[PDB]
Write an enzyme that holds these catalytic residues in place. Structure first.
Site, PDB file in Angstrom:
ATOM      1  N   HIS A 128      -2.462  -4.733   2.165  1.00  0.00           N
ATOM      2  CA  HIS A 128      -3.727  -4.237   2.712  1.00  0.00           C
ATOM      3  C   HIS A 128      -3.943  -4.251   4.230  1.00  0.00           C
ATOM      4  CE1 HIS A 128      -8.135  -4.785   2.624  1.00  0.00           C
ATOM      5  NE2 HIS A 128      -8.221  -5.710   3.129  1.00  0.00           N
TER       6      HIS A 128
ATOM      7  N   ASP B  80      -3.730  -0.095  -3.680  1.00  0.00           N
ATOM      8  CA  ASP B  80      -4.102   0.977  -2.625  1.00  0.00           C
ATOM      9  C   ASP B  80      -3.187   2.102  -2.774  1.00  0.00           C
ATOM     10  OD1 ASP B  80      -6.259  -0.454  -1.817  1.00  0.00           O
ATOM     11  OD2 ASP B  80      -5.763  -0.622   0.527  1.00  0.00           O
TER      12      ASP B  80
ATOM     13  N   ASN C  51      -8.356  -2.744  -2.582  1.00  0.00           N
ATOM     14  CA  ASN C  51      -9.756  -2.437  -2.358  1.00  0.00           C
ATOM     15  C   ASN C  51     -10.221  -0.654  -2.111  1.00  0.00           C
ATOM     16  OD1 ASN C  51      -8.334  -2.358   0.257  1.00  0.00           O
ATOM     17  ND2 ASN C  51     -10.168  -1.905   1.161  1.00  0.00           N
ATOM     18  N   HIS C  52      -8.992   0.028  -2.423  1.00  0.00           N
ATOM     19  CA  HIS C  52      -9.460   1.473  -2.465  1.00  0.00           C
ATOM     20  C   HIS C  52      -9.490   2.259  -3.907  1.00  0.00           C
ATOM     21  CE1 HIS C  52      -9.127   2.935   2.012  1.00  0.00           C
ATOM     22  NE2 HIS C  52      -8.588   1.633   1.732  1.00  0.00           N
TER      23      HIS C  52
ATOM     24  N   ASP D 291       0.981  -1.524  -0.100  1.00  0.00           N
ATOM     25  CA  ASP D 291       0.065   0.053  -0.012  1.00  0.00           C
ATOM     26  C   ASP D 291       0.900   1.021   0.018  1.00  0.00           C
ATOM     27  OD1 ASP D 291      -1.526  -2.214   0.598  1.00  0.00           O
ATOM     28  OD2 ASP D 291      -2.895  -1.319   1.976  1.00  0.00           O
TER      29      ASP D 291
ATOM     30  N   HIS E  19      -3.930  -8.138  -3.732  1.00  0.00           N
ATOM     31  CA  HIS E  19      -4.017  -7.306  -2.450  1.00  0.00           C
ATOM     32  C   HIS E  19      -4.487  -7.760  -0.991  1.00  0.00           C
ATOM     33  CE1 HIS E  19      -4.293  -3.302  -0.683  1.00  0.00           C
ATOM     34  NE2 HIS E  19      -5.370  -3.598  -0.224  1.00  0.00           N
TER      35      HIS E  19
ATOM     36  N   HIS F 185      -1.024   4.381  -0.832  1.00  0.00           N
ATOM     37  CA  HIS F 185      -1.931   5.598   0.303  1.00  0.00           C
ATOM     38  C   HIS F 185      -1.699   6.913  -0.022  1.00  0.00           C
ATOM     39  CE1 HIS F 185      -5.229   2.897   1.166  1.00  0.00           C
ATOM     40  NE2 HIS F 185      -4.467   2.079   1.952  1.00  0.00           N
TER      41      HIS F 185
ATOM     42  N   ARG G 116     -13.561  -6.298   9.351  1.00  0.00           N
ATOM     43  CA  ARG G 116     -13.822  -5.270   8.515  1.00  0.00           C
ATOM     44  C   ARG G 116     -15.375  -5.241   8.235  1.00  0.00           C
ATOM     45  NH1 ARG G 116      -8.855  -3.643   5.973  1.00  0.00           N
ATOM     46  NH2 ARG G 116      -7.353  -5.174   6.449  1.00  0.00           N
TER      47      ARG G 116
ATOM     48  N   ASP H 164      -6.133   7.332  -1.339  1.00  0.00           N
ATOM     49  CA  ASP H 164      -6.749   7.680   0.060  1.00  0.00           C
ATOM     50  C   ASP H 164      -5.815   7.593   1.029  1.00  0.00           C
ATOM     51  OD1 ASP H 164      -9.214   7.530  -1.130  1.00  0.00           O
ATOM     52  OD2 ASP H 164      -9.764   5.335  -0.421  1.00  0.00           O
ATOM     53  N   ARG H 165      -6.220   8.521   2.088  1.00  0.00           N
ATOM     54  CA  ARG H 165      -5.666   8.564   3.435  1.00  0.00           C
ATOM     55  C   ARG H 165      -4.421   9.573   3.327  1.00  0.00           C
ATOM     56  NH1 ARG H 165      -8.953   7.044   7.380  1.00  0.00           N
ATOM     57  NH2 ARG H 165      -9.154   4.644   7.182  1.00  0.00           N
TER      58      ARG H 165
HETATM   59 MN   LIG Z   1      -6.508  -2.701   1.426  1.00  0.00          MN
HETATM   60 MN   LIG Z   2      -4.709  -0.024   2.130  1.00  0.00          MN
END
Ligand SMILES: [Mn+2]
Ligand SMILES: [Mn+2]
Lengths: 293, 41
Positions: free
Chosen positions: A242, A86, A118-119, A58, A167, A60, A215, A89-90
């Site tokens: 992940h 990923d 997943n992002h 990731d 991922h 991010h 989750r 995001d963040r």
């Molecule tokens: Mn993830």
């Molecule tokens: Mn992630």
């Protein structure tokens, strides 16, 4: 579309005090999305890759950490890369991160590879920052263009028929590799099933077999699942991302699975290191670590 | 709804249930040592 110009401007801020933005034109970014999307669709949804290869987890939106990894591992095409998803995001610079990654995919399509995380999914990145960044710096129509490009990302990769990369992780629905090849693109991430699981599942030390995932989506899977899977498909290692891990990488089931997470000091909330894994031509794997501040 | 949106929706629904009926008709090691990229931290 001048790709070398775009990459030059993206790399220009290297060495600048972390956090300096690069503002490409909307048409340049739309061009990156549309061209990389074409390339994703022309290549298998289950990639079959050969070492030597450097693998990252990731990112991010931590653009300046991405540049540090490239600086140490070698900027494409010095080394071949596989990213496990990923990208957005963040972090504070999702846009520079995904633009540089897409630019390299277009420039070196046979030596640079990106999986879906997943992002890379509108309903997630709507909430965790990428939509906001697009709305602030561009417009929401560009965000929808990114989504259409994300919807075509490949889902998994096998390196030299021995390392299965994705991922999230395994799925109780994953019985043959051919099933991954049946997944149709473009696609959103469904809320259940094989595609969901490949992007969302986690290993868990306390579960024998398959368990519930805190989750609230997909599953957790135990060491025995990993072992029977590797045995059945004649693989040596699962390599996934992940989940944030203290040391940047973290083994599971006696080195049959490794988790990779490449964004150090994630979110400014964790004190984790980030790691990248280099795989040489003999499939000897080593870890390169970005220590936290 | 655009065609791309229609196709994406169709594919998403298809991808929810990938049938297990898929009928057709070098060894990993680990180095001992981690490399630190930014020891000045
Ligand atoms: Mn993830
Ligand atoms: Mn992630």
């Amino acid at each position: 579309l001048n790709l070398d110009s775009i990459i030059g401007r993206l790399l220009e801020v290297q060495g600048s005090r972390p956090g300096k933005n690069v503002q490409l034109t909307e048409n340049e970014i739309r061009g990156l999305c549309l061209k990389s999307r074409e390339i994703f669709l022309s290549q298998p949804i289950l990639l079959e890759l050969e070492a030597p290869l450097k693998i990252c987890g990731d990112i991010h939106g931590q653009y300046y950490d991405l540049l540090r990894l490239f600086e140490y591992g070698g900027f494409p095409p010095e080394s071949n890369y596989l990213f496990l998803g990923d990208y957005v995001d963040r972090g504070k610079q999702s846009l520079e991160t995904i633009c540089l990654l897409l630019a390299y995919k277009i420039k070196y399509p046979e030596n640079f590879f990106l999986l879906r995380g997943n992002h890379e999914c509108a309903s997630i990145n709507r909430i965790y920052g990428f939509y906001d960044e697009c709305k602030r710096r561009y417009n929401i129509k560009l965000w929808k263009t990114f989504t259409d490009c994300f919807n075509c990302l490949p889902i998994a990769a096998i390196v030299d028929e021995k390392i299965f990369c994705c991922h999230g992780g395994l799925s109780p629905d994953l019985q043959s590799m051919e099933q991954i090849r049946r997944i149709m693109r473009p696609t959103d991430v469904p809320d259940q099933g094989l595609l969901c699981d490949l992007l969302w599942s986690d290993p868990d030390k306390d579960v024998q077999g398959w368990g519930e995932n805190d989750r609230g989506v997909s599953f957790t899977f135990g060491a025995e699942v990993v072992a029977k899977f590797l045995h059945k498909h004649d693989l040596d290692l699962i390599c996934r991302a992940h989940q944030v891990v203290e040391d940047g990488y973290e083994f599971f089931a006696k080195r049959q699975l490794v988790t990779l997470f490449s964004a150090p000091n994630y979110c400014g909330e964790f004190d984790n290191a980030g790691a990248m894994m280099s795989v040489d031509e003999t499939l000897m794997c080593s870890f390169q670590i970005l220590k936290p501040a | 709804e655009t065609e791309l949106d229609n196709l994406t929706e169709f594919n998403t629904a298809h991808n929810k249930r990938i049938s297990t009926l898929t009928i057709e008709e070098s060894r990993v090691t680990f180095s001992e040592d981690d490399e630190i990229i930014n020891p000045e931290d």
